[PDB]
Design a protein around this ligand. Sequence first.
Ligand SMILES: [Cl-]
Ligand SMILES: [Mg+2]
Lengths: 231, 250, 195, 243, 111, 244, 241, 235, 240
Amino acid sequence: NNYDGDTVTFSPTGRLFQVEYALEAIKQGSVTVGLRSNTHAVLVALKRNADELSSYQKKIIKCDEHMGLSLAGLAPDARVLSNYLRQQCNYSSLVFNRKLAVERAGHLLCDKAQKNTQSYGGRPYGVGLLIIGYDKSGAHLLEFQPSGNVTELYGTAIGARSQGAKTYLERTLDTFIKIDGNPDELIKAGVEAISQSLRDESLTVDNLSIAIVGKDTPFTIYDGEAVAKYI
Amino acid sequence: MTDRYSFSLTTFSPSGKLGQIDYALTAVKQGVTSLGIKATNGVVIATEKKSSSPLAMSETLSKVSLLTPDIGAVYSGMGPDYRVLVDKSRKVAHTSYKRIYGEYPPTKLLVSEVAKIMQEATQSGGVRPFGVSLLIAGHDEFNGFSLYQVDPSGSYFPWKATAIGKGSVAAKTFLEKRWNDELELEDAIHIALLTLKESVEGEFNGDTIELAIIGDENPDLLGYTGIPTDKGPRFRKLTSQEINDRLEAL
Amino acid sequence: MDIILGIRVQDSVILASSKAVTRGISVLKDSDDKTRQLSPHTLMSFAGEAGDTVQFAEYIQANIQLYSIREDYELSPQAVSSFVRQELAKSIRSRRPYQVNVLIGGYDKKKNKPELYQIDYLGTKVELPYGAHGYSGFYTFSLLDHHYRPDMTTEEGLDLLKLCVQELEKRMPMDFKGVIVKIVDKDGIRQVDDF
Amino acid sequence: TGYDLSNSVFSPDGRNFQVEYAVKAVENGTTSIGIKCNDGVVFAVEKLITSKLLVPQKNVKIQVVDRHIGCVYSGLIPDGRHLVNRGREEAASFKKLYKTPIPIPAFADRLGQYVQAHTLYNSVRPFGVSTIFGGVDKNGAHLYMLEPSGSYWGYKGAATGKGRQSAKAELEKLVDHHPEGLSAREAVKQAAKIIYLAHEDNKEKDFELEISWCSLSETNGLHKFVKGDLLQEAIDFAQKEIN
Amino acid sequence: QFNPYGDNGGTILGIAGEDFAVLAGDTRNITDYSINSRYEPKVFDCGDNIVMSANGFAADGDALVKRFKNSVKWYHFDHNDKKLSINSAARNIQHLLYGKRFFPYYVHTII
Amino acid sequence: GSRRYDSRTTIFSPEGRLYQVEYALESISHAGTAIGIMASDGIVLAAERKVTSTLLEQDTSTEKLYKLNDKIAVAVAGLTADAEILINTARIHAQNYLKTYNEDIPVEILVRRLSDIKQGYTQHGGLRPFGVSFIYAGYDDRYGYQLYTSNPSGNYTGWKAISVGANTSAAQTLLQMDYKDDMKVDDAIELALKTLSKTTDSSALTYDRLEFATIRKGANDGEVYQKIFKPQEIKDILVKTGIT
Amino acid sequence: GYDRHITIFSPEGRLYQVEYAFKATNQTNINSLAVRGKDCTVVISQKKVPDKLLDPTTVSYIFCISRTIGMVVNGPIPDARNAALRAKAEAAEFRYKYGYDMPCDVLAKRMANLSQIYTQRAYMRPLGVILTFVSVDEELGPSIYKTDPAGYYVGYKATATGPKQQEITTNLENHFKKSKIDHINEESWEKVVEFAITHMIDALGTEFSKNDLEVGVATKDKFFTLSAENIEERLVAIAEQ
Amino acid sequence: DRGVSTFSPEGRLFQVEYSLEAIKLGSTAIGIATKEGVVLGVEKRATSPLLESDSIEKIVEIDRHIGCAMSGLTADARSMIEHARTAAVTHNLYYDEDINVESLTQSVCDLALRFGELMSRPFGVALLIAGHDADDGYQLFHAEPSGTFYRYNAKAIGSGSEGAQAELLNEWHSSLTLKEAELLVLKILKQVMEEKLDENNAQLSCITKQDGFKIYDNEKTAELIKELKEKEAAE
Amino acid sequence: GYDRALSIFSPDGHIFQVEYALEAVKRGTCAVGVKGKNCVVLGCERRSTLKLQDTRITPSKVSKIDSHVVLSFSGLNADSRILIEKARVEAQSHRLTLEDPVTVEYLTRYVAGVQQRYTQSGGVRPFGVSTLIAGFDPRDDEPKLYQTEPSGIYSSWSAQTIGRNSKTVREFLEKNYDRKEPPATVEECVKLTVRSLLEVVQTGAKNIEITVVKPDSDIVALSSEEINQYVTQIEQEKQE
Ligand SMILES: [Cl-]
Ligand SMILES: [Mg+2]
């Protein structure tokens, strides 16, 4: 109200309104789902078009051979953060000959987002990210909020109508976690999960975006006729 | 952890007033009376030592400060603002003058430098004006004796005699009647003590009055002998006893 | 660059400047004009290290031309020479100094007088009736000491200059490929095409 | 009015309302505690299980500084991480210059001055965390608690977050009933109990217990997490006491 | 005085065929009259069907190859996984080398 | 953050005026009147002091008339402290030009420089403008005698006769009435004092209230002399012109 | 009304932020007192540990600035520690640059000048503390110098600070009106501490245990703080006469 | 007042949303991508008849294979064009090749959100970036001041955009010839323009693989306008 | 440094500081530019509120940027000096690096770029100035006349006016200027420029300034008496 003019100001109940408004941009964004087993981790994203002449906005970004994310909210902010992740993954490789741990990647994103919430002039990031990866401790899925809060999860969803996919995954938890050594069945479960967040529109060939990383699988994105199999 | 006040806090109002300078002058008005009188053979500056507590040692608080061996200063208004101006005035007398010319600056130019510092606090980013008016008395070879007033705006004026702070309007009228161009230094000290008695409520003695002169050279106060040209400081702060002696002949 | 001469007569200043440009083994050019017009009545000839000479001359030219536009006025030869001297005097204590010596020949329209200034790369300025830079002066100053008069005409100045150039062509080891000559007077700057 | 809109502004009271508003963010957070024992310290925290989809034992809240200091905090979790990152820089530069690992009181003031600095300017926001931290140094065990204002004191027991009043009452009983002191293994058990008792304030969602400890005898004066059998023993002890 | 350069010996050889190319190099690494290693690979696969070797001072050679491999990685990120053509790779390497014009990578590079 | 407290000194009003410049000019309209009159054989600068007290040491006092170099002087209207900042900058610019070109600075070049400094404060930096208007009286060998004024906007203009400070509307009408192009310094002195004598808010115009100066090309052997009038000399010229 | 939020003048010539910083001074509800002996300077302060969970040994508003200089603070602990760290840094730097130990009155002046800057510069707030510096200076002898948020500072024969400062001040004033000297005419510091505690008891009208007080003593070439047991010995001697 | 980089309660940057309103006030620009080329057309909109209309440069060359049309505060586009040209030429210097149209667009869009308290506000101009490369063929992009860019088969920006876009919805198909696309841009421009369309107040351009980016002569456009009039009168 | 964003967008998509800078231009004295077949003429109003002026030394309204290009303006005078200075510097820098004087279009583009930069830089306000930049390119006999404004847009004009009552003089020029046949001579072009100013100026010849620029750096300012002859001839023809 009076305490939402900038990110440096707490409200009388201890809330940061500019951060909460940035959180709101994510809810307006298109739905994206994340889930994993012990062997693989999958991202599924519903891409959004401007109109029938336009292309569908890309939702998934590759960060390294073993790590990448999907976005929901301001796409330019996802580009800034993903670029930062690319550099940190790259720094870990060049200096230490070491693939960056997914947990440590989350910690870096948290701390980058935090600095923007405590200093004047800046603004919070206006995007949520779902980071998947396969590192030395197996498959991982992270959820990044621009408040700074990063969370390691078996599955989740962010964006508009994401609660539907999130409930499905909460029921399916015991099934999809066991989908080991079977990438197609894990993607099927992600495609079935994101379908719970759809209304009116359905999953078409240039609408759907899927990515996968795993044990002997580099982070690869599937778009176009490559995802027709899963429709 | 940034200084984001890069803009002026003193600005022109629709009426053409610089608010913060006017308000600083109001702070000066609330301050304790101080005065200055110029004689033929000297200058005197004086003020009341308004003690905040009787437990406080008012000797430690110096309202009258030596700036150079031949220049002294007194104020009305906010004491802390005065103390930092005295520090800066003493330093600028060395950096912008003595280290260049090998001698102390004349009164008017040191005043000019102080004035400049005060003007900058009236226009620079993220600062308020100084809440003091200074009375600077001094001597130099080519200008002789002189007395200057400096205001929060940075403006300065030379005076034959004047007063600033609490009872200045009444004090200035008193000085107008008594001042002439044939005054000796002792006569000016006598008039300074008479003028100051009117604005003081409580005790009036050497312990509650601070008074200094710019007068003859004091070779006894120099601290060394062997250089004929260095004859010693013209600034001298009168002792508690020296004030009480003149209060008997009052 | 090698030989640059200057001579101030009654009503003009004459600058003579060699045409050769030599890079080590070969003479790359035999028609080089080692001069810039700073303003309509002020000419600067120059000689020194390769690159630095032209870079400096053009830099000075740009600054004087900027002044002329800003004030709608031509600076006096004295003013231009003082500006040039200060640039060189600033240069000498730089990371990499301009190794350039110059002669500034100008006609002061206010005083109705020709003026010749000699300035070396250190910023050493002198007003002279005749001047030279480098080894030129070793041969030519004795001639000019003998033959010069302050009341000489421009034609007499050019004849005296031919006698300098003949002496340089006889006794100097380097073939400087002759000189371009330019006259600076009340009517401006013109080039003597046959010398 | 308007004194609460800008950080570092004194109200007519002499208060910095923005700092007091940061305290409300702290009071909104999950419960965290600290217990000083005979030869060390024990830290514990309440982690709310928002969803079944949270991976158990993975979203670790307690953080180590150097090798001998544990830090836990309640409120805005990123603000806590930022403070620990600074703490690690302070501990690193101290060891680089002076060789010895940073003493706990020395480390406390480093955080204290840094947090206090964020109440000096309107260009920055106060920290939205109270931080309970401590460990073992050359002079023995130390437990501290640091507020948004920069204020900190040494503690026998400390507690912050939504269940702080509940916890504080329980800690006060331990101080009274054990003047000679509490052992490290006892403090782990009692910490578990206190987090379980303090969970009545956050009783809607179920939670996950997380404990750490530094003890001269039990961990060689190094910060370690309580894991496996010792963690389960403390959970069983806590579960038995609530029933 | 400290000499930042050294000579690790070795020899490399590139030959271009009609529909193939070879880049060969000996595996010996030396300093002065001592053998450091009898098998220290000097020719590297850099991705995108490009092979590279930077023979001379091995520390500058390793540095350059490492930087070029990284340049291939960032080319993919920045230009939608486009294959870096050999001619483009060559021009990119010119800039890497010339970037240190006044403190050079002391190596003969062949790709 | 800090934005909350920023007055924004360098913005346009909806009408396309600079608030702070306008308000500075309002400040200057209360300052003591300064008049400059240019004649064929010299320039006069007259100015009225603001703070009549009997105890002000007038002979060592300088609030209105300042010397920039041997050829150029200024009359000040507005904040004296602000003027002194600018005056010292101008004094330096004149000596930089003299060092560079070995010629005294042309009057207009000095004026433009000061005016450009003032302009800067209206377009960037977020600081308040200088609450000062100058009358520049000077001589050079290009244009001869010149009068200029500059104001807080950084705009400057040339004049035959001009006033700044208080009552300029009244003052400019009186100057416009009695000024002629063939006028001489002695006549311009009389005009300047008569104009102040009528426009003054005081009861009478006296010597202790005035600062007065002339720039004459009537020094020995065709040089230019700046004369800043002493108190006694102002008193004499007041009796001569018949004002006291 | 933004003249009340930052350190600029109000129409009355007042700095409201400075005035409100003075009010922050009494937020702790602690009273301090300082007096001078012949050879010593004693400073006492109330100690209040309301929480049983606090480690009482770490609750302190007395600071050892240098070996010779002690400082008691009236105000919140974060600003107290801000001031303490800076005073320590300034005292150490002084010794390094100028080759002798920073005098008490010079440190007070330096900290007062820093406080003045916060009253003039807008981005920095004043610290909400009153700093009372104590030493046995090698030139001036037993010394008490006090600084506040306005940037004011002055020397004292004795002084008091806190919510009930006026009661303590008048008590001390009356004693020095009788004795007609600027100090406590007593050889040992132990008896000067006993005087200080006695005259605080009389002024505040409250009795003290060993854990209710905190004492700092300055002697020639060292300043130290008394333990609870050293205070207990002091309290026993008071009660026994 | 309020921060320049402030989020609204709906999760949008105020300044970015306000700059989008400035772009609505701008003159129309239309782009149509085909397999034979990409056509770019603009409304010139001279404010007075004395203004020499050929000096209105709202269609601009970035490289030989990339063109650009603008709409909104067109003075803001100059530094964007400068950056685009430099990016294109710089990439050719580093890689001995043409730069991808997407990569060029992405470089332009990276400037967009560099504003705060860097430049003081977002750009008040939208760009249609049209080009060809070997990898993805003929492409048309819409570069906004939000930092987002969308590829389009056809796109209209400026004051007549929503009307023009609905018309492009019906008219565009994947088999359009270049000649057909030229007439279609002229048709839709004539529809949404206030003044009557001619060769002086409207400008055409295209980009083909063979000839690269070309701004059409007024004589050439005049013939295409005359061809349009006849084909509309034909039914 | 002072970084504050003064030029920003408002909810309706306007940059008020830029628009308020145009209001400063509207207040400024009228300036007009008319290009003939082989010349360009720049006319400028001088307000007659200011008499007792010294016209020798007062800043003239038309400024030479180089020997072949001139710049006139309407708006804040102090602001105009900053643009003129930068332009004059860029003109000499172009000669120094390209070995050729600036084209009129190039110089205009530069000045317009500076004006634009001040509409999206922190801490600065826009220039309260619109310019008319006129001249002939090197070795070219085609006349050039451009206009700039605070936003930074620029464009070429057969004829144009800016400043106070520019609406009226643009009305006059829109009906009196024929593109198919522009003013063939210098006389005709100057006459049309004086005529256009006489719609607004409302006083004789002291208030009008005329500067004629011809090809190959031939720039001359007309005197009072030369302009006064045009004023006399116009009104004598008008009495009919
Ligand atoms: Cl200090
Ligand atoms: Mg402050």
